[PDB]
Amino acid sequence: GSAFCNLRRCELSCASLGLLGKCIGEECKCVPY
User: What does the sequence similarity comment in the record state about its family?
Assistant: First the structure.
């Protein structure tokens, strides 16, 4: 595809829980660090 997910759009959304995020295409996943 020509377009992909933003890292802030996962790192902020996982910081709402209290941890870091990483994003693949559109799917955001949270990690402890």
Answer: Belongs to the short scorpion toxin superfamily. Potassium channel inhibitor family. Alpha-KTx 05 subfamily.
